[model samples]
Target: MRIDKFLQSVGLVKRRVLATDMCNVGAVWLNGSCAKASKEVKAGDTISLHYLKGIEEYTILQIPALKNVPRKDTHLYIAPKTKE
Candidate 1:
C-alpha cells in the first residue's frame, strides 16, 4: 500500500494529506531509504519518520483492511519500535 495512506489508515499521522506532505518533503523513510507517498510497503516493513524531533520507527504488522483503523486496534496493524 502507499506509505501515505498506510500512515493515515493505521493512525500514524493525523491525516492522509499530512502524510503525503511529509513524504513529498522527504520526511518518510522505509528500510533506511527515503520513501515517497506513493512508495509501497508490505507487512513487516520497517518505516521511519526521519529527523522528526528524534526518530519514530514502526513495523507494518498488517495492511489495514479498513479506511481508518480504530484507535484501540491500531497496535494490531502498526507496531511501535521504541527500542530497536
Candidate 2:
C-alpha cells in the first residue's frame, strides 16, 4: 500500500492528506531514505517521520484489510520503534 495511506490506516496521522503532505514535502522516510507519497510499503519495513526535535520511527507489522483501523488494533499493523 502507499506510504501515506498506510500511515492513515494505521492511525498514525489523523488524515490521509496530512500523511501525503508529509511525504510530498520529504518529511517521511522509509528505511532511512526519504519516501514519496506513492511509495509502496510492506510488512517489516521501517518508517520514520521527521518532526521538530527528532524522528518518530515505526515498523510495519502487517497491512490492514481496511483503511480505518481501530485504535485498539493499531499494533497489529504497526509498532513504535522507541519507548514513549
Candidate 3:
C-alpha cells in the first residue's frame, strides 16, 4: 500500500491527490521522517499524519487491494492514541 492511499481509506484526506499534497507539504510522516506521496507502506509500518492542525497516526492494518475502501471502515479506523 502507498501512504497516500492509506490516508484516504480512513477519510483523513478526501482524495489520494490531496494525500499526496499533504506529504509534499511535510504533513505526513513515516517512522518519524517526513514521507513522500509515493512512499511505499509495508505491513506493520506505522505512519503519522497531520492535517488542519490535527495529528493522528495509524498502523498499516491491512493493505486493501482495491483503490477505494468501504465507508464503514472509515468510522472503524481510529488512531492508536485517542483521548476518548
Candidate 4:
C-alpha cells in the first residue's frame, strides 16, 4: 500500500493529503527511520509515528484486501504509544 493511503486507512491522519504534509514535516517513520510519504508499505511493515509525547509504533498485522475493514477490527494493528 502507498504510504499516504496506509496512514489514512489506519486513521493515523484524517486525510491522505494531511498525511503527506505530516510526512514532509518528519512526523512519520518506517521501522525506526523517518519515511517518505510515497514509500510503499505492505503487510507486516512496522510503522512508527511521532506523537507529541513520544514515538508510537505499530506493525501491520494484515491489510484488508477488500474496500474497507470494520472499524472495531482496526485496533488489532495498533500498538500503544511509547510513553516518555
Point out the higher-scoring one by lDDT: 1 or 2. 2
lDDT of 4 at 60: 75
What tens digits encode model 4's per-residue C-alpha lDDT throughout 15-62? 534336768777778777888878766676677777677766777765
TM-score (all chains, Cα) for each model? 0.77, 0.78, 0.70, 0.68
- State the TM-score for model 1: 0.77
Q: What does candidate 3's lDDT look like per residue over 1-83, in tens digits?
A: 67777766566667524325776767778877887778877766677877676777777655554466667764333345445
Worst 10 residues of 4 by lDDT: 61-70
Q: lDDT score of model 4?
A: 0.65
Question: Mind giving the per-residue lDDT tens digits that candidate 1 earns over 2-73?
Answer: 667677666666752433577776767888898777777888778787654778888888776566676788
**Candidate 2: pairs in clash:** none
Ranking by lDDT: 2, 1, 3, 4
True-vs-predicted CA distance for residue 65, candidate 3, Å: 2.6
In terms of lDDT, which candidate is strongest?
Answer: 2
Off by over 4 Å in 2: 16-19
TM-score of 2: 0.78
**Residue-level error in angstroms, candidate 4, position 43:** 1.6
- Per-residue lDDT tens digits for candidate 2, residues 1-84, read 767777766676685343357876566788989977788887877888877777788888876656667678877778778666
Which regions of candidate 4 fall more than 4 Å away from where they truly are? Answer: 16-19, 65-70, 77-84
Per-candidate clash tally: 0, 0, 0, 0
